[PDB]
Each structure stands twice: as C-alpha cells, then as structure tokens.
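Worked example 3. Consider a protein that binds adenosine-5-diphosphoribose.
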Amino acid sequence: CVVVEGSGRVADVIAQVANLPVSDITISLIQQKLSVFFQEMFETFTESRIVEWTKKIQDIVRRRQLLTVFREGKDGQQDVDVAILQALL
Amino acid sequence: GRTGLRGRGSLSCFGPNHTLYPMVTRWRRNEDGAICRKSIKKMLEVLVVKLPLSEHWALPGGSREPGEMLPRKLKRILRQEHWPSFENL
Ligand SMILES: Nc1ncnc2c1ncn2[C@@H]1O[C@H](COP(=O)(O)OP(=O)(O)OC[C@H]2O[C@@H](O)[C@H](O)[C@@H]2O)[C@@H](O)[C@H]1O
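Given these inputs, the predicted complex is written out as structure tokens:
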C-alpha cells in the first residue's frame, strides 16, 4: 500500500507516523494528530473510536515491509510510477 | 526595590494597600454543548467589566478596605443587591 503525502485527512495522519517506532504511538498522540486534520468533525470523536483507530494504525505500521509513503517530493512531482515500483520491489 | 518616586501617590495608605481580585471562570461550549477544543487544551471564559472612562476590560476586583463586601466594593452596582450577598456566601 502506497499512501500519498499532502493529500487529505487520513493520508497525512498515516504519513506522519511512518518512520516512528511502533511503541512510540500514544493514544493521546493519535487523537492529537487526529483532531487537527479532522477539524471539521474533530468534536464528533469518542474514546472508543479513538482506541479503535489507534489499534488499527498500530497494526498497520507494525508491518513496515508492506507500506510506503509517496512523500510528495514536490520538486519534480515525478509520477506515481516511481513510488509504485519501489512498493513492488 | 526602587521605583523612582518618593511618597504616597494616589494610593490610600503606606506599605501595601490590601485588595482582593476575584476571577470567575467557566468552560466554552460548542453548538452541541461539548467543550470547544484548541490544538491541545480547551477554551475558557471569564466575565469582565468595561467602565465608560477606562477604555479597557478588567477584572471585577475591589479594594479590601471593607471585609466581605470588597467584591461588592467592586460589584455592588455590578452584580446585585441582596443576591450579591448570597453569591458572596
Ligand atoms: N494595574 C493596573 N493596570 C492598568 N491600569 C491601572 C492599574 N491600576 C490602576 N490603573 C488605572 O489608574 C487609574 C486610576 O486608578 P483608580 O481610579 O484608583 O482605579 P479604579 O478605581 O479601578 O478605576 C476607576 C475608574 O472610574 C472612572 O472614573 C475612571 O476612568 C477609572 O477607569 C484608572 O484609570 C485605572 O485605569
């Protein structure tokens, strides 16, 4: 799975927690980064939704092999192709 | 330390002139009634006064020349007359 940086809500909150160690995720940090990007519906979040999304983001960023960020390099803004090839390999 | 002016000035007496500054605080709710949120912390509301020749908002705090009605010395005309003593209780 390749995520694209500078795109939207869920993309940015996955892309920020890419290179982080797996134990360094705090459930406080999740809702902190969540409510700024979800600032339209940030107040619509409950604690059970926060712990579910924290568990899911944890179990995703565990498997570091199967994920890549596009990084939105934005100096050439080359293609999706350069990302998709490394995410294949 | 030193201030640069000898004397009493516009103060009542020498030394300290004792006064009480009360503050009222409450939370700031959204359209739903939940707490509005900052980046991390929350939003707070205080009740302030503006005098016609002060050109400034300030706390309703009075000189502690009377004992218990020093908030009333700030807020007899502001708060109430009889219910003011109840809120002072
Ligand atoms: N900590 C302070 N910070 C800023 N200004 C101050 C402070 N303390 C006093 N002042 C200013 O000093 C001036 C004289 O002080 P007082 O008159 O003793 O203060 P107070 O009794 O709280 O204000 C009386 C108010 O009634 C009006 O007639 C007059 O315009 C004044 O705003 C006031 O205009 C007040 O704005």
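Take a moment to read the result before moving on. The interface with chain A takes residues 30, 32, 34, 36-37, 39-40 of chain B (CB under 8 Å). The helical segments of chain B are 70-75, 83-88.
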